Design a protein around this ligand. Structure first.
Ligand SMILES: O=P([O-])([O-])OC[C@H](O)CO
Ligand SMILES: [Mn+2]
Length: 424
């Protein structure tokens, strides 16, 4: 089994990149705020419905003129674990499983996670805040293995009927209360706010809606317009609150959609909404879920690098000024000149700057037209994608970190973590 670990470690070496000196260590020991946008797809960005911008605040952030760097070609890489897969990848630079949920199935594996590294190297205390109860997706168990210090679950919020919809706490109260909790925390902290309202079936009380539904006839697509607008407004107010609390200017703030909200089941209505037939290639394009990052002392902008959620962990570590040569990671630093511009998807599809590979066919990104002459780098890229997924699965299935005596990582004792019931 130690030999199995060795094979994976060796495999991860070639892709390693050097930090961009413009960005290396610039965020050392600064608070990091990580904002999860449930089911958020960037087709929403700049989209109007009945003349109204669905997501006006995120539209401003996506302009690059509001201190955030926006990545318009940024993809989730999730599978059946949905939010839990995104979390898994964001904090480990590993893939979830091809079937089922890594959180649910591998919750007591050994990990060398981002929050644990930040704690060990720079004294960060980490938290997750979320308006659902802690054992959903096995988070209670998994977070102890990741080395997360605090988990403000639903017991930390007022879950009365007036404050809930669908799965639990409404995003507006969630963000308001969460900002108040964050203001009371000791620095440096690494805080992850997981939202909830923009979740299937995308239902919102009329009293809470500020935009009318689209009129495609598909209740899922039509409702999504309302819950997406609601989330955008919740986020806008949250950023205001950060500014009032002195938590904006000197924080790294990242925002990301966890995975697609609208499946191929809704192709008829999505063609109406977007004014284009949803071919397999087009659906792949619609898996863009976005990344926005504000870094103190750095201007915003638009960065067109094709990238996936596996890339976030090495990016954050390099921003903090941490050497990552000994970490087993599949992603590479977004700001590094050598960033590997290949994005594996869980089903074996993938995308690059020039083309996408979808259900065994190659399409040019320019026009989504079929490519019949194999690109020069296709076999190389296809092999990387297949082997990335297999090597990652080997870590999970063999629980391979058990065998890793990492010079730059002290083994986590999960029993040292406990998440107490909140005051509400
Ligand atoms: O994984 P999903 O269904 O997208 O989101 C669910 C939750 O985050 C539940 O707390
Ligand atoms: Mn989700």
């Amino acid at each position: 089994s130690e030999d199995d670990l060795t094979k994976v470690l060796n495999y991860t070496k070639q892709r390693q990149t050097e930090p961009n000196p413009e960005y290396y260590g610039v965020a050392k020991k600064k608070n990091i705020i990580k904002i999860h946008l449930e089911s958020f797809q960037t087709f929403l960005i700049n989209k109007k419905v009945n003349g109204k911008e669905v997501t006006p605040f995120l539209n401003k952030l996506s302009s690059g003129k509001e201190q955030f760097t926006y990545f318009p070609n940024f993809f989730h890489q999730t599978g059946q674990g949905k939010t839990s897969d995104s979390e898994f990848t964001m904090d480990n630079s590993l893939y979830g499983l091809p079937q089922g949920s890594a959180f649910s199935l591998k919750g007591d594996n050994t990990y060398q996670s981002l929050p644990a590294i930040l704690d060990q190297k720079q004294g960060y205390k980490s938290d997750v805040m979320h308006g659902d109860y802690k054992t959903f997706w096995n988070r209670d168990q998994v977070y102890k293995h990741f080395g997360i210090d605090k988990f403000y679950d639903a017991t930390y919020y007022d879950m009365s009927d007036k404050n809930v919809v669908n799965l639990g706490l409404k995003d507006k109260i969630f963000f308001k209360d969460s900002a108040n909790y964050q203001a009371k925390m000791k620095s440096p902290f690494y805080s992850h706010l997981i939202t909830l309202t923009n979740h299937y079936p995308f239902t919102l009380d009329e009293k809470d809606a500020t935009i009318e539904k689209s009129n495609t006839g598909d209740a899922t697509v039509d409702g999504y317009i309302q819950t997406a607008r609601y989330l955008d407004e919740a986020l806008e107010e949250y950023i205001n609150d950060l500014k009032k609390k002195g938590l904006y200017d000197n924080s790294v703030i990242m925002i990301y959609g966890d995975h697609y909200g609208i499946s191929e089941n809704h192709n008829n209505a999505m063609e109406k909404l977007l004014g284009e037939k949803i071919t397999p290639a087009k659906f792949t394009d619609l898996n863009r879920t976005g990344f926005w990052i504000k870094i103190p002392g750095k201007s915003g902008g638009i960065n067109n690098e094709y990238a996936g959620q596996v890339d976030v962990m090495p990016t954050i570590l390099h921003l903090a000024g941490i050497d990552t040569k000994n970490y087993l990671m599949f992603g590479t630093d977004l700001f590094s000149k050598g960033h590997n511009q290949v994005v594996p998807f869980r089903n074996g599809d993938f995308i690059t700057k020039d083309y996408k590979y979808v259900n065994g066919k190659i399409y040019s990104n320019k026009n989504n037209e079929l490519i019949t002459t194999q690109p020069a780098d296709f076999e190389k890229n296809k092999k990387q994608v297949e082997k990335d997924l297999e090597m990652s699965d080997n870590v999970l299935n063999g629980d391979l970190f058990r065998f890793y005596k990492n010079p730059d990582f002290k083994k986590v004792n999960p029993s040292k973590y406990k998440y107490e019931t909140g005051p509400k």
